[PDB]
Enzyme design. Structure first.
Site, PDB file in Angstrom:
ATOM      1  N   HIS A  15       5.987   6.451   6.975  1.00  0.00           N
ATOM      2  CA  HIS A  15       5.142   6.689   4.985  1.00  0.00           C
ATOM      3  C   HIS A  15       4.816   7.856   4.402  1.00  0.00           C
ATOM      4  CE1 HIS A  15       1.390   5.579   7.413  1.00  0.00           C
ATOM      5  NE2 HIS A  15       1.050   6.645   6.605  1.00  0.00           N
ATOM      6  N   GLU A  20      -2.920  13.538   0.939  1.00  0.00           N
ATOM      7  CA  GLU A  20      -4.590  12.667   1.216  1.00  0.00           C
ATOM      8  C   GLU A  20      -4.469  14.487   1.773  1.00  0.00           C
ATOM      9  OE1 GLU A  20      -3.599   9.082   3.968  1.00  0.00           O
ATOM     10  OE2 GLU A  20      -4.090   8.376   2.099  1.00  0.00           O
ATOM     11  N   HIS A  31       0.654  -1.092  -0.204  1.00  0.00           N
ATOM     12  CA  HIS A  31       0.252   0.232  -0.002  1.00  0.00           C
ATOM     13  C   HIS A  31       0.955   1.776   0.148  1.00  0.00           C
ATOM     14  CE1 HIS A  31      -0.584   0.060   4.923  1.00  0.00           C
ATOM     15  NE2 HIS A  31      -0.351  -0.921   3.547  1.00  0.00           N
ATOM     16  N   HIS A  66       3.724  10.786   6.208  1.00  0.00           N
ATOM     17  CA  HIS A  66       3.247  10.585   7.937  1.00  0.00           C
ATOM     18  C   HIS A  66       4.219   9.857   8.831  1.00  0.00           C
ATOM     19  CE1 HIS A  66      -1.590  10.138   5.643  1.00  0.00           C
ATOM     20  NE2 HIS A  66      -0.479  11.433   6.141  1.00  0.00           N
ATOM     21  N   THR A  97      -6.256   6.384   7.646  1.00  0.00           N
ATOM     22  CA  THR A  97      -6.862   6.796   6.324  1.00  0.00           C
ATOM     23  C   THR A  97      -6.123   5.960   5.448  1.00  0.00           C
ATOM     24  OG1 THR A  97      -4.368   7.571   5.037  1.00  0.00           O
ATOM     25  CG2 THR A  97      -5.470   9.228   6.131  1.00  0.00           C
ATOM     26  N   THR A  98      -6.537   4.552   5.771  1.00  0.00           N
ATOM     27  CA  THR A  98      -6.497   2.893   5.679  1.00  0.00           C
ATOM     28  C   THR A  98      -6.905   1.812   5.842  1.00  0.00           C
ATOM     29  OG1 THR A  98      -3.992   2.878   6.328  1.00  0.00           O
ATOM     30  CG2 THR A  98      -4.060   3.663   3.674  1.00  0.00           C
ATOM     31  N   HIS A 149       2.381   8.932   0.866  1.00  0.00           N
ATOM     32  CA  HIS A 149       1.432   9.140  -0.771  1.00  0.00           C
ATOM     33  C   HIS A 149       1.743   9.584  -1.177  1.00  0.00           C
ATOM     34  CE1 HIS A 149      -1.538   6.392   3.580  1.00  0.00           C
ATOM     35  NE2 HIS A 149      -0.756   6.990   4.082  1.00  0.00           N
TER      36      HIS A 149
HETATM   37  O1  LIG Z   1      -3.151   6.483   8.363  1.00  0.00           O
HETATM   38  C1  LIG Z   1      -2.178   6.896   7.934  1.00  0.00           C
HETATM   39  C2  LIG Z   1      -1.848   6.998   8.951  1.00  0.00           C
HETATM   40  C3  LIG Z   1      -1.578   6.447  10.125  1.00  0.00           C
HETATM   41  C4  LIG Z   1      -1.187   5.135   9.849  1.00  0.00           C
HETATM   42  C5  LIG Z   1      -1.214   4.395  11.332  1.00  0.00           C
HETATM   43  C6  LIG Z   1      -0.472   2.861  11.455  1.00  0.00           C
HETATM   44  C7  LIG Z   1       0.488   2.512  12.180  1.00  0.00           C
HETATM   45  C8  LIG Z   1       0.786   1.398  12.617  1.00  0.00           C
HETATM   46  O2  LIG Z   1       1.777   1.281  11.810  1.00  0.00           O
HETATM   47  N1  LIG Z   1       0.815   0.067  12.883  1.00  0.00           N
HETATM   48  C9  LIG Z   1      -0.746  -0.025  13.443  1.00  0.00           C
HETATM   49  C10 LIG Z   1      -1.956  -0.368  12.401  1.00  0.00           C
HETATM   50  C11 LIG Z   1      -3.087  -0.692  12.717  1.00  0.00           C
HETATM   51  C12 LIG Z   1      -3.504  -1.176  13.497  1.00  0.00           C
HETATM   52  C13 LIG Z   1      -2.399  -1.944  14.164  1.00  0.00           C
HETATM   53  C14 LIG Z   1      -0.924  -1.494  13.969  1.00  0.00           C
HETATM   54  N2  LIG Z   1      -2.359   6.672   7.019  1.00  0.00           N
HETATM   55  O3  LIG Z   1      -2.489   5.926   5.610  1.00  0.00           O
HETATM   56 ZN   LIG Z   2      -0.335   7.919   5.882  1.00  0.00          ZN
END
Ligand SMILES: O=C(CCCCCCC(=O)Nc1ccccc1)NO
Ligand SMILES: [Zn+2]
Length: 258
Positions: free
Chosen positions: A92, A104, A62, A117, A196-197, A94
């Site tokens: 990471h 985003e 992704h 982000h 956002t995912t 986007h």
């Molecule tokens: O949503 C976002 C920004 C925040 C991303 C959060 C990811 C966190 C992670 O790496 N670990 C994790 C994610 C979901 C559930 C458990 C751990 N960008 O798409």
């Molecule tokens: Zn992100």
């Protein structure tokens, strides 16, 4: 099927598996700069990255992410709208297929070429998985990228992308200093939002910096050579891995600056 950014599995489909997609505090949003209110109460932000320990860089199908050791308070975000200490877990990006899209968040409907982000979780919850179940579980620092001059601090990332071209690939990525990704000013907008995912959990305090960083055309072109697919499957370039702006609903975006 499984979610992604295509016509048949993209953002307009995510609500079927993740009904919170139509929730009350979804991200990203458009930041209307004339409606954001300056909040003189917001405490000065504190980005303490001097002891950050990067571990690996990963293509997760992704985006690509750089992961850090978050088993101790080494790289932390505090202050601003935040109560307590938030540990850096990973960053990471986007980005778009063309320089006029990829971010985003948008600013007065303007889309940037990409968005970084830096993902942090609230240490009072003990682990990221518990944090994502809390309304103040994560703090994400969002930084816009525009195309112009190169960002020297981004080059070590771009140079290893050839080694993680396809989904599931990873590489050792030690001694990377994320301070080299930050703009000069820490002026920001902030609002309560979500991942956002998928799973789109409503657990994020968003802190979006006003000042973009500039990267070069050659730097962003290397992002666009990654693949969403795994080694052996039809090649589908990893481009346009952004969710569009969602309804602001009953939220106010606050500014740290006048
Ligand atoms: O949503 C976002 C920004 C925040 C991303 C959060 C990811 C966190 C992670 O790496 N670990 C994790 C994610 C979901 C559930 C458990 C751990 N960008 O798409
Ligand atoms: Zn992100």
């Amino acid at each position: 099927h499984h979610w992604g950014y295509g016509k048949h599995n993209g953002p307009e489909h995510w609500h079927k598996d993740f009904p919170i997609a139509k929730g009350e505090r979804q991200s990203p949003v458009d930041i209307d700069t004339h409606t954001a209110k300056y909040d003189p109460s917001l405490k000065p932000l504190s980005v303490s990255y001097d002891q950050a320990t990067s571990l690996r860089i990963l293509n997760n199908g992704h985006s690509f992410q750089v992961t850090f050791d978050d088993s101790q308070d080494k790289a932390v975000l505090k202050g601003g709208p935040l109560d307590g200490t938030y540990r850096l877990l990973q960053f990471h990006f986007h980005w778009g297929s063309l320089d006029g899209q990829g971010s985003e968040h948008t600013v007065d409907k303007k889309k940037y070429a990409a968005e970084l982000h830096l993902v942090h979780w609230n240490t009072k919850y003990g682990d990221v998985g518990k944090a994502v179940q809390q309304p103040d579980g994560l703090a994400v620092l969002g930084i816009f990228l525009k195309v112009g001059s190169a960002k020297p601090g981004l080059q070590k990332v771009v140079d290893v992308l050839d080694s993680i071209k396809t989904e599931g690939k990873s590489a050792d990525f030690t001694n990377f200093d994320p301070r080299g990704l930050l703009p000069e000013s820490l002026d920001y907008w902030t609002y309560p939002g979500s991942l956002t995912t998928p799973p789109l959990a409503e657990c994020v305090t968003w802190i979006v910096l006003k000042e973009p960083i500039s990267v070069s055309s050659e730097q962003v072109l290397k992002f666009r050579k990654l693949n969403f697919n795994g080694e052996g499957e039809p090649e589908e370039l990893m481009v346009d891995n952004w969710r569009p702006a969602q309804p602001l609903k009953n939220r106010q975006i606050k500014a740290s600056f006048k």
